[PDB]
Write a protein that binds this ligand. Structure first.
Ligand SMILES: Cc1cc2nc3c(=O)[nH]c(=O)nc-3n(C[C@H](O)[C@H](O)[C@H](O)COP(=O)(O)O)c2cc1C
Ligand SMILES: Cc1cc2nc3c(=O)[nH]c(=O)nc-3n(C[C@H](O)[C@H](O)[C@H](O)COP(=O)(O)O)c2cc1C
Ligand SMILES: O=C(O)c1ccc2cc(CCCCc3c(C(=O)O)[nH]c(=O)[nH]c3=O)ccc2c1
Ligand SMILES: O=C(O)c1ccc2cc(CCCCc3c(C(=O)O)[nH]c(=O)[nH]c3=O)ccc2c1
Ligand SMILES: C[As](C)(=O)[O-]
Ligand SMILES: C[As](C)(=O)[O-]
Ligand SMILES: C[As](C)(=O)[O-]
Ligand SMILES: C[As](C)(=O)[O-]
Lengths: 314, 314
């Protein structure tokens, strides 16, 4: 109660909230809007070496229970986000994370080598997106554990500084164990963000008998209400398996209560995607007020009092 | 004159609706209740060779958006379900499916060897559950493609008659492609039921700060509203990839509209889990009336006029 400020990764944050990568963070306008908001931090749109237009529209739709997207990695290119980080962002306002999602390991290594001096000079933080396009005959990198171990080996070497990793959801305990073990081989991986969208859902409109996004025959990643228990499970699974890392929660946050659950499950930062897309950046003042109210009601004065303290039965 | 009738797998169904395995189907009382209902078919609780008590309670909980469970395969044992199939079920009322979920390939083989003559004589239909664990610390069988191929080879050889398979959801296009390719190696796999519960979610209660089920530190499979776009994607993905098989839809059905979406995605039968657990078997008359109303509004007279006809954009 009182104030939500916290310290992590050799930075100070006013509160644990931030946007999820890809939401309100693609253009200079969007990054300035996130900076002006009451969020504790912001993350940039995942970038590639070159600018991309992304997929044809419609490519995002939202509904009462959440959203579906197949954006196709539309972004202004790494040079722009790096310039934002190195010249434009006002670090006095809040910390900045830069998300990178190159289409190959080599692309990622090349970007991280460029980011490193800006990281050292300005304190921009790297979130490596371990989600991928479809390559027939090949699953996304975080779903291929030896591939994942390679990327991280090369990035760690190339980058040489503390970073984090944006994960897709897993649905199987053995996968939790294997994925966490991979991540725990890398001491430079200081945070784990759980989760990216639940992959390849399909929303159909009954009146028109049609899928609602154009790309990929309507198939796209799900966010929002649909995915909150999945997200909670991933946050908690990695919190338990990676005691020497931070876990950032992402998925299904619409209220301070939802944020409270993510923090109980183990989240240090709490990222907001769908709900921010649909409500706008005003959501951050609401979420902070709601979280402080729940804390006050419960007698909690700090996040640390309850982070990771979800109770099990017997 | 509109009609919900189907004729598949050598059987006639009054309508496409049935329970999802595990819901209202464990005991003789359950089975007789499902038989008495308006459903077009029923499926028994997934069985093992020996009776099982399942996991400690609480092991199922439901909420406005769906359910979580870790039941632990509680069942009366194979001999009970076989007896029900052989001696007790009134086939004049509707078709019966028997679900099996042995804990090893050998257990499944033993069961289907003994089921075969009753399948031939009485027409009971086998649904093989491929979300069984096999070796603990390995993923569930359907998430291990080699194990899945082995189970299907062995069961095909032992059983020798058309059967179907119950699949977990997949979230990666590469997995849809691999999984369907595996299935398409087995000509006796005549139907594919998509989907089982979305694995290892975690529901947390904010007031008590506690998980809501006891087993597995609160981790369990998700059903209900959470999972409908995941279910639809899997139904459509297998419908497109397995043109010589039927697809049965399961997941997130609460209304005739939800059923209509399943059917547009490619579903033949439509199974009802969570919603049936919550509402009871009266749900089947409501689903039939609701589906018929949508069909009337659109001018459709039979299910075939729209099964699989979901539209894509462009
Ligand atoms: C429109 C849109 C674009 C996104 N783009 C990215 C991205 O560039 N990088 C990434 O890591 N995740 C991206 N995501 C995933 C979100 O960061 C987040 O993991 C997901 O939407 C789940 O959170 P939610 O339930 O709050 O929406 C995107 C999501 C949306 C809805
Ligand atoms: C209480 C409970 C028990 C279940 N037991 C089984 C089972 O024995 N075999 C099986 O194939 N699926 C089982 N399932 C999964 C359901 O058949 C179904 O695939 C899942 O609940 C998703 O459908 P829904 O959204 O309608 O709940 C069970 C589900 C619940 C809720
Ligand atoms: O040609 C296509 O249809 C297509 C479709 C999807 C593609 C996806 C990628 C990787 C997406 C990474 C960024 C991202 C996005 C996104 O930008 O679509 N959405 C999301 O929910 N999570 C993310 O991490 C990269 C290329 C893609 C290409
Ligand atoms: O006692 C054990 O060591 C033990 C052994 C094997 C176990 C196997 C399972 C698999 C559950 C299959 C049935 C099933 C269930 C279930 O009965 O829990 N729930 C669900 O959502 N889908 C299903 O398909 C679940 C729990 C199991 C526990
Ligand atoms: C707020 As926008 C269209 O740049 O994500
Ligand atoms: C157990 As207390 C003082 O947070 O209600
Ligand atoms: C209706 As029951 C407890 O046998 O699933
Ligand atoms: C024409 As067909 C339903 O047998 O693929």
């Amino acid at each position: 109660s009182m104030c939500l400020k916290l310290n992590l990764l050799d930075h100070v944050f006013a509160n644990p909230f931030m946007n999820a990568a890809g939401v309100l963070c693609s253009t200079e306008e969007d990054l300035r809007c996130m900076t002006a908001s009451s969020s504790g931090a912001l993350v940039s749109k995942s970038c590639t070496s070159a600018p991309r237009d992304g997929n044809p529209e419609p490519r995002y739709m939202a509904f009462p229970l959440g959203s579906i997207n197949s954006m196709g990695l539309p972004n202004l290119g790494f040079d722009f986000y790096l310039k934002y980080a190195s010249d434009l962002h006002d670090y006095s306002k809040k910390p900045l994370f830069l998300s990178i999602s190159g289409l190959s390991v080599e692309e990622n290594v090349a970007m991280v080598r460029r980011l490193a001096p800006v990281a050292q000079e300005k304190g921009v933080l790297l979130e490596l997106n371990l989600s991928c396009p479809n390559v027939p005959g090949k699953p996304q990198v975080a779903y291929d554990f030896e591939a994942m171990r390679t990327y991280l080996q090369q990035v760690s070497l190339a980058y040489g500084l503390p970073f984090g990793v944006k994960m897709p959801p897993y649905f199987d305990i053995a996968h939790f164990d294997t994925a966490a073990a991979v991540l725990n081989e890398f001491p430079l991986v200081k945070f784990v963000t759980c989760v990216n969208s639940v992959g390849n859902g399909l929303v159909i409109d009954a009146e028109s008998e049609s899928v609602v996004i154009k790309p990929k025959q309507g198939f796209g990643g799900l966010g929002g209400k649909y995915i909150l228990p999945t997200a909670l499970a991933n946050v908690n699974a990695f919190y338990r398996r990676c005691p020497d890392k931070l876990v950032f929660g992402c998925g299904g946050v619409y209220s301070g209560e939802d944020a409270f659950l993510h923090i109980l499950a183990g989240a240090s930062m709490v990222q907001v995607g769908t709900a921010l897309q649909e409500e706008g950046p005003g959501i951050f003042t609401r979420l902070e007020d709601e979280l402080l109210e729940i804390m006050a009601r419960k007698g909690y004065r700090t996040l640390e009092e309850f982070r990771g303290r979800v109770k099990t039965i017997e």
